Design an enzyme around this catalytic site. Structure first.
Site, PDB file in Angstrom:
ATOM      1  N   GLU A 178       0.854  -1.186   0.000  1.00  0.00           N
ATOM      2  CA  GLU A 178       0.000   0.000   0.000  1.00  0.00           C
ATOM      3  C   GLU A 178       0.896   1.244   0.000  1.00  0.00           C
ATOM      4  O   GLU A 178       1.873   1.299   0.756  1.00  0.00           O
ATOM      5  CB  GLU A 178      -0.920   0.027   1.237  1.00  0.00           C
ATOM      6  CG  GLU A 178      -1.952   1.131   1.095  1.00  0.00           C
ATOM      7  CD  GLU A 178      -2.909   1.255   2.249  1.00  0.00           C
ATOM      8  OE1 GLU A 178      -2.724   0.526   3.247  1.00  0.00           O
ATOM      9  OE2 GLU A 178      -3.845   2.084   2.153  1.00  0.00           O
ATOM     10  N   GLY A 191       3.486   2.072  10.520  1.00  0.00           N
ATOM     11  CA  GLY A 191       3.316   1.396  11.784  1.00  0.00           C
ATOM     12  C   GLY A 191       2.931  -0.059  11.617  1.00  0.00           C
ATOM     13  O   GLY A 191       3.431  -0.928  12.333  1.00  0.00           O
ATOM     14  N   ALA A 192       2.014  -0.343  10.695  1.00  0.00           N
ATOM     15  CA  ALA A 192       1.520  -1.697  10.471  1.00  0.00           C
ATOM     16  C   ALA A 192       0.694  -1.692   9.201  1.00  0.00           C
ATOM     17  O   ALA A 192       0.452  -0.633   8.611  1.00  0.00           O
ATOM     18  CB  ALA A 192       0.745  -2.236  11.683  1.00  0.00           C
ATOM     19  N   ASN A 225      -2.687  -6.445   5.547  1.00  0.00           N
ATOM     20  CA  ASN A 225      -2.772  -7.407   4.448  1.00  0.00           C
ATOM     21  C   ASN A 225      -3.617  -8.595   4.883  1.00  0.00           C
ATOM     22  O   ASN A 225      -3.452  -9.111   5.987  1.00  0.00           O
ATOM     23  CB  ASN A 225      -1.393  -7.917   4.038  1.00  0.00           C
ATOM     24  CG  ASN A 225      -0.361  -6.818   3.961  1.00  0.00           C
ATOM     25  OD1 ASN A 225      -0.410  -5.950   3.082  1.00  0.00           O
ATOM     26  ND2 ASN A 225       0.593  -6.843   4.892  1.00  0.00           N
ATOM     27  N   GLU A 234      -5.502  -2.707  12.753  1.00  0.00           N
ATOM     28  CA  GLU A 234      -5.271  -3.591  11.613  1.00  0.00           C
ATOM     29  C   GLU A 234      -6.321  -4.691  11.551  1.00  0.00           C
ATOM     30  O   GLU A 234      -6.775  -5.051  10.461  1.00  0.00           O
ATOM     31  CB  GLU A 234      -3.861  -4.158  11.629  1.00  0.00           C
ATOM     32  CG  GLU A 234      -2.759  -3.112  11.691  1.00  0.00           C
ATOM     33  CD  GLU A 234      -2.836  -2.059  10.635  1.00  0.00           C
ATOM     34  OE1 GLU A 234      -3.415  -2.341   9.569  1.00  0.00           O
ATOM     35  OE2 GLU A 234      -2.296  -0.936  10.868  1.00  0.00           O
ATOM     36  N   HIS A 280      -9.573  -3.321  10.087  1.00  0.00           N
ATOM     37  CA  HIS A 280      -9.540  -3.179   8.636  1.00  0.00           C
ATOM     38  C   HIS A 280     -10.028  -4.426   7.928  1.00  0.00           C
ATOM     39  O   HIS A 280     -10.376  -4.344   6.749  1.00  0.00           O
ATOM     40  CB  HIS A 280      -8.121  -2.935   8.141  1.00  0.00           C
ATOM     41  CG  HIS A 280      -7.707  -1.502   8.067  1.00  0.00           C
ATOM     42  ND1 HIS A 280      -8.438  -0.552   7.379  1.00  0.00           N
ATOM     43  CD2 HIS A 280      -6.565  -0.880   8.469  1.00  0.00           C
ATOM     44  CE1 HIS A 280      -7.781   0.601   7.396  1.00  0.00           C
ATOM     45  NE2 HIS A 280      -6.648   0.433   8.057  1.00  0.00           N
ATOM     46  N   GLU A 308      -9.794   4.624   6.300  1.00  0.00           N
ATOM     47  CA  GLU A 308      -8.950   5.081   7.402  1.00  0.00           C
ATOM     48  C   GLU A 308      -9.719   5.870   8.448  1.00  0.00           C
ATOM     49  O   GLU A 308      -9.509   5.664   9.646  1.00  0.00           O
ATOM     50  CB  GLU A 308      -7.738   5.848   6.912  1.00  0.00           C
ATOM     51  CG  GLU A 308      -6.814   5.037   6.018  1.00  0.00           C
ATOM     52  CD  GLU A 308      -6.339   3.731   6.660  1.00  0.00           C
ATOM     53  OE1 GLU A 308      -6.405   3.613   7.918  1.00  0.00           O
ATOM     54  OE2 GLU A 308      -5.920   2.839   5.897  1.00  0.00           O
TER      55      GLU A 308
HETATM   56  N1  LIG Z   1      -3.435   0.841   5.804  1.00  0.00           N
HETATM   57  C1  LIG Z   1      -2.203   1.212   6.555  1.00  0.00           C
HETATM   58  C2  LIG Z   1      -1.438   2.312   5.817  1.00  0.00           C
HETATM   59  C3  LIG Z   1      -0.130   2.717   6.504  1.00  0.00           C
HETATM   60  C4  LIG Z   1      -0.338   3.751   7.583  1.00  0.00           C
HETATM   61  C5  LIG Z   1       0.096   5.059   7.401  1.00  0.00           C
HETATM   62  C6  LIG Z   1      -0.169   6.035   8.346  1.00  0.00           C
HETATM   63  C7  LIG Z   1      -0.846   5.703   9.498  1.00  0.00           C
HETATM   64  C8  LIG Z   1      -1.262   4.397   9.701  1.00  0.00           C
HETATM   65  C9  LIG Z   1      -1.020   3.414   8.748  1.00  0.00           C
HETATM   66  C10 LIG Z   1      -1.487   1.994   8.970  1.00  0.00           C
HETATM   67  C11 LIG Z   1      -2.606   1.515   8.058  1.00  0.00           C
HETATM   68  O1  LIG Z   1      -3.202   0.348   8.566  1.00  0.00           O
HETATM   69  O2  LIG Z   1      -3.685   2.390   7.998  1.00  0.00           O
HETATM   70 NA    NA Z   2       3.363   4.573   2.086  1.00  0.00          NA
HETATM   71 ZN   LIG Z   3      -5.495   2.013   8.602  1.00  0.00          ZN
END
Ligand SMILES: [NH3+][C@H]1CCc2ccccc2CC1(O)O
Ligand code: NA
Ligand SMILES: [Zn+2]
Ligand SMILES: [Cl-]
Ligand SMILES: [Cl-]
Ligand SMILES: [Cl-]
Ligand code: NA
Ligand code: NA
Ligand code: NA
Ligand code: NA
Ligand code: NA
Ligand code: NA
Ligand code: NA
Length: 868
Positions: free
Chosen positions: A119, A259-260, A263, A296, A299, A318
């Protein structure tokens, strides 16, 4: 030439879909060979070519239905294939080099492991593909590798095949039944310790949980495992959502720009958000692991089962997933502390973004480099927008909206507008005006005037709103602002809200540029609590008296309001004293202000969790948002002077509360965390007591601490107050912890944020420290990022030395790791908030960077906006 901006209004459905992809990786750090067999279907015009994205790939072959293809061309960033049938099998073979990937985007090396980050647009660094999130394909992934070096070969889903080969190699094949966009693809290869456990869903599905960590780290994994189970249980209880696969893998890696990452079935985490032991990790680390594990996990539904049609819809996943992680942390822990700290982030960091050259709506309209839009705005303001929907709908309606959203959009790539429509349709609440929150940038300012009429027993609020223009948008319009209030009588009792014989909801709908709200049966002149629970992400202008605010600190029903009143009270005197500092005058603070904080210390009925936050002064970044032009030196020195004045005036009470909150047992339990946060909030002030008393108290806490929370609090105090013991404690910590990068990050932050006159010399020298390396994003952020972003007084030294240092670092990182470089440049793009002499030096720094050979798109986008 730099890439051109892309626009949300240009969205077009893809000319081709890929329904299924079979990948084979013949893995090696120096050379990996990728074979990708995709089943494609044309949706667009019969003469349209297939345009595949690809970056830094060595193309070996192209076949269509096993025929070597001649009707293709490679162009910048792309492979363009012409003259195709309506349905066909595409086979691409290409080579990549993980060991050369310092940007940590695509397939790269983390120590001895190989891992991915896809991503937003990293999969195109692995193979030529439709690297756009509205293309949803069923993946099967075969991984071939040396067995000794890479005994664990992981990808999304379930293991469906495995074998052994000659010359010491082996392979595993994975199948993930859920169609996905390629940004959710993951691959990991390496040698790991594995913590294995089980979660049984409420309907009886047994899920195997597997946490992969570097060898020797198993005893640092149980809290993350516990937090995963807690996340799974909470999503069932609160949202009615169960996990949908058979295994849930998490891999902790040391080298990771984010941070994480969510997937599907194979999350990859920065080790910072997995590993914890009580001697090495603080209470805040434990709660951050909890919230990131939760994020995570959440998501899986809000991002994976329903994904994003295009990257301009990023906040669809997000904002909603951040809201979910906040609600999870708040339910399990202290809701008031969670809300307080999320509001601190909004007011102290996101507001700064939303007036800066990088300002954007939560749904952007224009992007050059997408990985620049993983922002405080998209995430934190995004969540505030979700929370406003929740405020307008209530929990029951909000959950009906969630249910309708999933019913309509499960298995698809949806838009922000789809989500709003589901909420509107399920709840019957009109969100047409509300949608403007998705399209308008900047922070609204809500101005309130009041009037109490004793003849009619009516109280009238006159409420106005405006959003100043931002650099990205010249037109601003009124928003639908949910504006929550509460009215208090002279005894601190709530006054019922009513008009014309009917109750009035406490959430006022502020939808016009100006409007009035009349309340009757107001038997006493109220003290109002306004914008309760920070009910909309706005700046509030109301002419509080000090007495109204101290009244709310004593009487407001919601803990958040008591904290917020204290912030308003302090704001007046922070502003007063910054102006004084600029004229060479010392701190001035009315006695009655100190007394309000004395009362908080001595109030046995206040939750220690709340008292601790009231006794935590706003950060220098929160303070900066109070000012039109930021004077970072005045702000830093006023913050210290205010700390010293309160330390002197409250010395006896601070020590009594410090001692009363001593705990011999260490537990990661919310009540114990609150008492410790209160004790350590007192310690911050006690560190500024008489020098020897303070030195003894602080050094004792450091040496006697049975946990890292208390040790780090003492070390931080020794640095903040420049106490005699500082150098000895800092050296002891280095000698004990230098081999543990996560622990040393705390020490680098303290070095970078030190008030010492020689901080920059120290920081520069630490570029050679045994525990520092420019190859590791965490080390970079903890030393360089903390200096530039968290020590604005030193970064903005009047000699310009801070800017020159950052230019040197960004010159390296622009080539090495542009994503980290782009995070680190943010302090320089705020130049218009500073005085003219500083602006001149910051512009010169940005013009130097603008002229770099091979300037990354990441930095180009920000530099261009800042220099406009
Ligand atoms: N989808 C990922 C994207 C990377 C990212 C960038 C900025 C803050 C958090 C995160 C973690 C996330 O889980 O949102
Ligand atoms: Na990035
Ligand atoms: Zn996220
Ligand atoms: Cl190799
Ligand atoms: Cl690890
Ligand atoms: Cl409360
Ligand atoms: Na075929
Ligand atoms: Na709670
Ligand atoms: Na890009
Ligand atoms: Na008035
Ligand atoms: Na008033
Ligand atoms: Na209410
Ligand atoms: Na080093």
């Amino acid at each position: 030439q730099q890439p051109q901006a892309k626009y949300r209004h240009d969205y077009r459905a893809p000319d081709y879909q890929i329904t299924d992809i079979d990948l084979t990786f013949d893995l090696d750090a120096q050379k990996t060979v990728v074979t990708a067999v995709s089943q494609a279907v044309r949706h667009g015009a019969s003469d349209a070519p297939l345009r595949l994205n690809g970056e830094d790939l060595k193309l070996v072959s192209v076949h269509i239905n096993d025929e070597p293809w001649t009707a293709w061309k490679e162009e910048e960033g792309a492979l363009v294939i012409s003259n195709l049938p309506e349905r066909f099998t595409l086979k691409i073979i290409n080579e990549i080099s993980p060991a050369a990937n310092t940007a940590l985007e695509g397939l790269y090396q983390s120590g001895d492991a190989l891992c991915t980050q896809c991503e937003a647009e990293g999969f195109r660094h692995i193979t030529y593909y439709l690297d756009r999130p509205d293309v949803l394909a069923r993946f099967t992934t075969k991984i071939i590798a040396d067995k000794i070096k890479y005994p664990f070969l992981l990808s999304n889903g379930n293991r469906v095949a495995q074998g052994e080969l000659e010359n010491g190699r082996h392979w595993v094949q994975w199948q993930d039944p859920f169609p996905k966009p390629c940004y959710l693809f993951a691959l990991v290869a390496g040698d790991f310790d594995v913590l294995r456990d089980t979660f049984t869903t409420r309907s009886g599905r047994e899920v195997a949980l597997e946490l992969y960590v570097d060898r020797g780290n198993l005893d640092r994994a149980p809290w993350a495992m516990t937090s995963l189970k807690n996340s799974m249980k909470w999503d069932e209880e609160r949202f009615g959502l169960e996990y949908d696969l058979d295994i849930y893998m998490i891999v902790a890696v040391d080298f990771f720009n984010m941070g994480a990452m969510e997937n599907k079935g194979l999350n990859i985490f920065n080790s910072k958000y997995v590993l914890a032991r009580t001697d090495t990790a603080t209470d805040k680390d434990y709660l951050d692991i909890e919230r990131v594990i939760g994020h995570e996990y959440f998501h899986n539904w809000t991002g994976n089962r329903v994904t994003c049609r295009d990257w301009f819809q990023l906040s669809l996943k997000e904002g909603l997933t951040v809201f979910r992680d906040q609600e999870f942390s708040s339910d399990l822990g202290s809701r008031a502390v969670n809300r307080i700290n999320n509001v601190r982030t909004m007011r102290g960091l996101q507001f700064a973004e939303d007036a800066s050259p990088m300002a954007h709506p939560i749904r952007p309209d224009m992007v050059i480099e997408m990985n620049n839009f993983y922002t405080l705005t998209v995430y934190e303001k995004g969540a505030e927008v979700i929370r406003m929907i929740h405020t307008l709908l209530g929990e029951e309606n909000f959950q009906k909206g969630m249910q309708l959203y999933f019913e309509r959009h499960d298995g698809s790539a949806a838009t922000c507008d789809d989500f709003v429509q589901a909420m509107e349709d399920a709840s019957n609440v009109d969100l047409s005006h509300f949608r403007r929150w998705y399209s308008q940038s900047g922070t609204p300012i809500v101005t309130v005037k009041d009037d109490y009429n004793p003849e009619t027993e009516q109280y009238t609020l006159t409420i106005s709103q405006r959003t100043p223009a931002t650099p990205d948008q010249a037109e601003k319009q009124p928003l639908h602002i949910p504006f929550a209030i509460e009215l208090y009588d002279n005894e601190g009792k709530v006054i019922p809200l009513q008009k014309g014989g009917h109750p009035v909801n406490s959430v006022l709908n502020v939808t016009q540029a100006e409007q009035t709200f009349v309340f009757d049966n107001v038997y006493f002149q109220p003290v109002p609590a306004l914008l309760c629970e920070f009910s909309a992400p706005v700046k509030l202008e109301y002419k509080w008296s000090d007495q109204q605010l101290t009244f709310l600190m004593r009487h407001a029903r919601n803990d958040f309001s008591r904290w917020d009143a204290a912030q308003s009270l302090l704001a007046t005197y922070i502003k007063l004293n910054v102006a004084r500092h600029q004229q060479g005058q010392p701190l001035s603070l009315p006695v009655h202000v100190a007394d309000a904080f004395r009362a908080v210390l001595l109030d046995e009925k206040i939750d220690p969790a709340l008292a601790a936050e009231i006794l935590t002064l706003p950060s220098v970044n929160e303070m900066a948002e109070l000012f039109d032009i930021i004077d970072p030196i005045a702000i830093a020195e006023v913050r210290e002077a205010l700390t010293r004045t309160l330390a002197t005036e409250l010395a006896d009470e601070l020590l009594a509360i410090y001692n009363a909150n001593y705990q011999s047992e260490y537990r990661v339990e919310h009540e114990d965390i609150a008492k410790r946060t209160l004790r350590n909030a007192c310690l911050r002030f006690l560190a500024f007591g008489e020098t020897h008393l303070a030195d003894v108290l602080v050094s004792k806490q450091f040496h006697e601490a049975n946990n890292m929370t208390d040790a780090l609090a003492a070390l931080s105090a020794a640095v903040a107050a420049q106490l005699p013991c500082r150098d000895a404690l800092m050296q002891e910590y280095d000698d004990k912890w230098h081999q543990n990068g996560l622990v040393m990050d705390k020490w680098f932050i303290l070095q970078a944020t030190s008030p010492a006159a020689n901080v920059l010399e120290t920081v520069r020298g630490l570029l050679q420290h045994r525990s520092f390396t420019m190859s590791n994003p965490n080390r970079i952020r903890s030393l360089i990022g903390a200096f530039a972003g968290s020590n604005p007084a030193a970064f903005h030294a009047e000699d310009g030395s801070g800017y020159l240092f950052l230019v040197e670092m960004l010159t390296d990182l622009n080539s090495r790791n542009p994503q980290v470089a782009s995070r680190l440049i943010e302090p320089l793009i705020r130049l218009k908030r500073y005085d003219a002499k500083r602006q001149e030096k910051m512009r010169a720094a940005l013009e130097q960077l603008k002229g770099l050979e091979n300037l990354s798109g990441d930095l180009y986008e920000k530099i261009t906006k800042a220099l406009a």
